[PDB]
Design a protein around this ligand. Structure first.
Ligand SMILES: *[C@@H]1O[C@H](CO)[C@@H](O)[C@H](O)[C@H]1NC(C)=O
Length: 210
C-alpha cells in the first residue's frame, strides 16, 4: 500500500514536492524507484529501512538542501544502481556516507558545494562507472583520489574553480593518461592560466607560491 504523502504507479514510489523531512513511513517491499526529490531534506540520517527493499534500484534526492549524510543512511542498500544527490548543499564527501551501496553504478553529486576531493572521499565505491562532480566548488584534488574507483568511465569535473598550483600538478598527468571522459576541466587560478585545460599545462607552471 502507498505511503501517505507519496504516489505509487507501477514499481515507482513518488514522494516529490511534499515539503518532507524524513523518508515516509511504509515503503512497499516491491518498490524499485524511490523518489524523494524536490523536498526539504536537511540531513540524511542512519535508517536501515533499506535493509528490506531488495527491489530498489534507484533513489532520487535531487533538489533538497542536504548538508550532511550520516554513516548508514544507506545501510543494507546492496541493490541500488544510482543515487541522485544533484542540487544539494554537501560541503564535502567521505566514503562513510556511502557505506551500504555495494552495487552503486551511478553517483550524481552535481551542483553541490564540495570544496575539495579527499585522498579517500570515494574509497570503496569500486563499482561506479559514472560520477558527476559538475558545478561544485572544488579547488584541488588529493593524489590518487580516484585510483580506488576501478569501474570509472565517466567523471565529470567541469565547472569547478580548480587552482592549478603545485598541489594539482599530478591531476594533469592523471588526466592525460587515464582514458576516461572528463569534459576537459580548465584551470581557474592562477590568473595566467585561467581557462586553460588542466591537462595542458606544463609540469613547470604548477607552482604554489612559497
Ligand atoms: C592518503 O593515503 C592513504 C591511503 O588512503 C591514507 O591513509 C592517508 O591518510 C592519505 N595521505 C595523507 C598524507 O593524508
Amino acid at each position: 500500500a502507498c505511503p501517505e504523502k507519496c504516489r505509487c504507479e507501477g514499481t515507482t514510489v513518488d514522494c516529490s514536492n511534499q515539503k518532507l523531512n524524513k523518508i515516509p513511513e511504509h515503503i512497499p517491499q516491491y518498490t524499485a524507484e524511490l523518489r524523494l526529490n524536490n523536498n526539504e531534506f536537511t540531513v540524511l540520517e542512519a535508517t536501515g529501512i533499506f535493509k528490506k527493499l531488495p527491489q530498489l534500484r534507484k533513489i532520487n534526492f535531487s533538489n533538497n538542501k542536504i548538508t550532511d549524510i550520516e554513516e548508514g543512511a544507506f545501510e543494507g542498500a546492496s541493490g541500488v544502481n544510482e543515487i541522485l544527490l544533484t542540487s544539494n548543499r554537501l560541503e564535502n564527501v567521505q566514503h562513510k556516507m556511502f557505506k551500504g551501496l555495494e552495487s552503486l553504478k551511478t553517483l550524481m553529486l552535481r551542483s553541490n558545494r564540495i570544496t575539495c576531493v579527499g585522498n579517500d572521499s570515494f574509497i570503496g565505491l569500486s563499482s561506479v562507472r559514472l560520477l558527476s562532480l559538475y558545478d561544485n566548488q572544488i579547488t584541488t584534488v588529493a593524489p590518487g583520489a580516484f585510483d580506488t574507483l576501478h569501474s570509472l568511465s565517466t567523471l565529470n569535473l567541469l565547472a569547478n574553480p580548480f587552482n592549478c598550483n603545485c598541489y594539482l600538478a599530478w591531476l594533469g598527468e592523471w588526466l592525460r593518461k587515464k582514458r576516461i571522459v572528463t569534459g576537459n576541466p580548465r584551470c581557474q587560478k592562477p590568473y595566467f592560466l585561467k581557462e586553460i585545460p588542466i591537462q595542458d599545462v606544463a609540469i613547470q607552471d604548477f607552482t604554489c607560491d612559497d
